[PDB]
C-alpha cells in the first residue's frame, strides 16, 4: 500500500497478510460469486492504493492460478492506445498491463498515472473475467 | 478513517469483528446502525470507507435500500427536500466523487455523506 | 483513546475493536456480577482516557442496552449542584451528562475538565447501577 | 506502559488487552502456583515500565481480587523507612505504596523514583504472598 | 524488512511472526507445490525488501532443513563473475550468496546492491531446486 | 527490541506476547531439539535486537527455568577479558554477562557495546547448552 506520510511524501507499507487472508476467508470465491470478490478488490484498489507488487498479492491470494490467469488475460484486452482505442500492439498492451514487475516509480508523475492506470485495466480484467 | 489530517484504511479485523459480533440489519437494524453510527464519528471515514463498511456488514439487498433512502432524505441549502437529480447526485453520490479531505468544501461534503447515510439507515429500518 | 504523542500533542484514535470483544469475552455480563465490569471500566476510563463518542461504545459494547439505561440514568442521578446537592434540573444535568454528543473540546480546559466529569459521573452511574 | 520517545520524553501508551488476556491464559492461576505469574510480573514491571494504573490493569486482569489485596498487603508491609527499618506509620506507608491513585508525574525524577520504587515493593508483594 | 522512511533513509522493521506463520500454513510446503511458495516469497522479497537475516527467517520458516540447503546450493550454483558469466571461484560465491552474516549497509550503494544481488540468486535458487 | 525509528535514532519497544507464544508454540521445547530454539534465538538476536531484559522475556517464555539455568551457565563459562581470552575472574564474568539486571544505557555507546557482547555471549550459551 500507498499513503500519504506526516510529510506528504508518499509512503510504502506492504499489506498485512492479516487481511490478505481475511478477505479471503469472509467471501465466495471469485468464480460462485465473482462481483463479491471484484466489489472489495475494487474498494481496496482505492483505499490501499496498492503497487504493481500489492496487485500481485492481492490477486496471487484470491484468485486460483486460472482465475487469474483469465483475468489479466482481460485486463491485457482491454488496452487502448493513445488515440482512446482499443489496441493488441504487443509492446503497447505490455507497457499499459505488463506481466513482469515493471519499473514504474511511483514518485513521478509517469509511475503514478501508469499505476493508475494499471487498477483501472485490472478492475476491468475482473468485471470482464466475471461475466 | 481519517484522524488529525491523516488517512489509514480499515483494518479488516475491524470489519469483520463488528459484523461477526452483532445481527444482521434486518433482524435488528438499530444494533448495526448504532454501531455505524458511532463509528461515523469515531474512525471519521471517507466515502470509501462508507463503502467498505455498508459493504461488509449489509447484504446488498440492504445496502441498495439504504442508500436508496439516504438519497430519498437529500436537501437543498435552504433546508428543504429535493430530488432535483443533481442536487441528490453531488450529496449523496453512488459514484465515487472526488472530494477533498484538507479543503473546508471536501470536509462539508463528507459530513454531509454520514448525515445522509445515518439518516438512510434509519428510515431503512423501519 | 486520547494520549500525547512522540513529539507531545494530545492525540485521538478509536479504540480497537478487539479490545472492546476481549472486554467482553473475558469478563461476565454486568448483570451476572457488576463489580468485574465495572473494575473495568474503570480502568479502561484511566488508561484510555476516552472521548464521549470513546465512552458510547465502550457502554454500547459491554453493557446491555437496558443494563447501559439504568447506568446513564444514575450517572444523572449523580450529578450535584455547585451547593453539593442532588440536581434534576434538566439542564445543570446535562452540562454534566449529556445524553446526546456535546461539543466539548478536549485540546481546551473546559472539555478536559467536562470529560474528566463525565468518567466520574459514569463510573458512579456504573456502581450505583450495580448497588 | 511507558518508554523513552524521540523527544527524550517518557511516553505513554495503554496495555494491549491481548498481551494480558494472553499473559493470563499461558500461565496457571498464582493460587495454583506463584511462581509462574510472578517471573511475568516481574519482567513486564521492566519491560514495559507500567505506571500505577497499569499495575492495577495488570494485577486486576492476571490476579483475583482475594490474591491481589493479599500481595497488596505484603507489599506495603515491605515498606521501609530513611532508617532502613520497617514503618507501619500510614503516612510513610502510602507515599511509598498508595491503594489510591498518587499523581506521581513520569516526566519528573520524583515521579519516576516513586514509580521504580512502587515497583519494587509489588514485586516484593508477590514474592512474599507466594511463600 | 526494509522500506523508504520520513527522514529519506530505508528503515528496518523485524517480521511479525503471524505474517510469517500465516504465510506457513496458507499454503502447501515447497515440496507438495514449490511454485506457491515461490510465488510467495519472491514477491516478498520485492514488498517486504528483507535484509540477509530476514530471509534466514524467512527460509527457517517456510522450508524444512532439506529444502533449505537445497535452495542455497542453487542459489550458489547461479553466482555470475565480473564478466556475467557462472563462477565457482569461492571467494565470489561466498562474496554474493555467503552462508553466514555479512556486513551489507543498506545506506550505501555497496550495501543495497549486495542486498539486491543476494535476493536475485535466492529467487534463482527457489526456482531451480524448485523443478 | 531495539530499532531506528523513521525518525533516525535507537528507540525501545515491549516483545508483543503474540510473537513469545507464537515462536513457542511453532517449535518443539530446547530439550527436544536444541538446534530450531537456538536458530530461531539466534535469528531475533539480530532482528530484533534485544535489550538484557528483553533477553530474559525470551529466554523465560521459551525455556523451562532448567534450561535457561544450563544456558546461563555455558554463557558465563565463555566470557573473555580484555586481552582477548578465557578470563573467567568473577569482575570480568559479570561486566560481560550479568545475572542481575545490570546499568546498561543503549542510547550510549558503551550501553549498545554491552549489548552486543552479551547477546554473541548467550549464543555461545544456547549453543553449548545446547550440545549436552
Known sequence: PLRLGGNGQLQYWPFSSSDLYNWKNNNPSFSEDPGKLTALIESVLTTHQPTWD?????????????????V????????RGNDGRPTQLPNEVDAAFPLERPDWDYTTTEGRNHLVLYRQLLLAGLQNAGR
Do not use: I, S
Not at 489479466?72 to 488496452?79: D, H, S
Open 72 to 79: 489479466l488475460l482481460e485486463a491485457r484486452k482491454a488496452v
Open 54 to 70: 500489492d496487485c500481485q498479492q492481492l490477486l496471487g491470494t484470491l484468485l486460483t492460478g486460472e482465475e487469474k490467469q483469465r
